[PDB]
Amino acid sequence: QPEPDMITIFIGTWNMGNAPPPKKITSWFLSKGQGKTRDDSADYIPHDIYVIGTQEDPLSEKEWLEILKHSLQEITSVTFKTVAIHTLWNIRIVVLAKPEHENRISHICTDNVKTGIANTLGNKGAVGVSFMFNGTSLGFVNSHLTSGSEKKLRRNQNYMNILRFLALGDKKLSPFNITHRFTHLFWFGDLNYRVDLPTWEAETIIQKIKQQQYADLLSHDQLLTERREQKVFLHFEEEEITFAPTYRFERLTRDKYAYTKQKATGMKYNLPSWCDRVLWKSYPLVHVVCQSYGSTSDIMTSDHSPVFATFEAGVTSQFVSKNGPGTVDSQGQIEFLRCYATLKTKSQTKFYLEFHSSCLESFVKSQEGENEEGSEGELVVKFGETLPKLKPIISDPEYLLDQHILISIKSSDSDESYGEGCIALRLEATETQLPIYTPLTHHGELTGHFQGEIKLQTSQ
């Protein structure tokens, strides 16, 4: 039975509005409703992995698991296995997988982050799950960020606290946050970003939604504008939105947006908004294709509609050779030549690199680089041809060309990372000097760049 080189992943996010679900929620898992929807001819084909994020979830874990499993069994006639379930207050993530994948899934991690301080601590935050699927690491984050149209900056802060403090994936990747620990990272939830138009325009916005004319609304969506200004979700992708705003509906219909201020809303307006989102970040040159992104039309117990997204995702097998794992394969080598880091720091410490990869027995520390001043005010750290030759555990090009090298640039004085990035080994050529590049981030914000040349030797 051959190992897969692709899987499909379902991501759902639903803010349930503290109400039990209706008796049938199959449309959610079938990617049916509005937006980029799934073809009817696929309805019986199970996804490999289903990841369900809820917010304002009133059910116990047991009650929700029974509903989810019975929903999937009705659609697919497959009894899914529970990989993980994790709940923080009323924020929950469930991961289900086809039974044939049970032996392929390992290193299962869960965590949560509580956002805010005092007043703002007690209901918002994130849950996450990570695991290995054969040779591929997968991470999933369900966040419920701060509400309210005038709190985009707090949402951005919530995002940075979650990616800093959520402890998922390989704890040996110590300089790296969740935005670098996984082959594929999916981040979804009630992100709570709003359409930033005047209150007086509410009925105009409703009109536009009835005409399915979303362009002048999306141009005011805070998540798209904050992303375009590099204030949040740097280096994440989102499929184009082609479904109506998913919030705020009158319950038991989808015919009415309930936007006006009420005591129950703290006297806040809730103009129709795309609160409910799915974003992703995959390592460079790994296959990831969004095959659906939309909202259901027929699940009306909440003031939000459920959102679905589905993906093709490249995966790799758990490779064994006669040499690695448990030794190096002397027929393989990675050389980083004429590399330099450009840093936005005003610090004048010396810097060294760490190279981390599951193709190495352990991470590799470089010598210190040579600091120079850049012409427009920056620090350039030059490494020359000084960098240690990396010795991969396996030299087979079928394995090595699918790997990635994480790079951290650390201060000699403090050992703290000033920037993290990732280089694909999916090169155009072996035994050939080729340009490489990654942006460097720290706490998910841009701190610099790393560029130079690579020369990869495989067994072929």
Ligand SMILES: c1csc(CNCc2ccncc2)c1
């Ligand atoms: C439910 C869905 S995944 C899972 C974990 N499976 C661990 C494993 C067991 C044997 N061999 C390889 C991996 C439980």
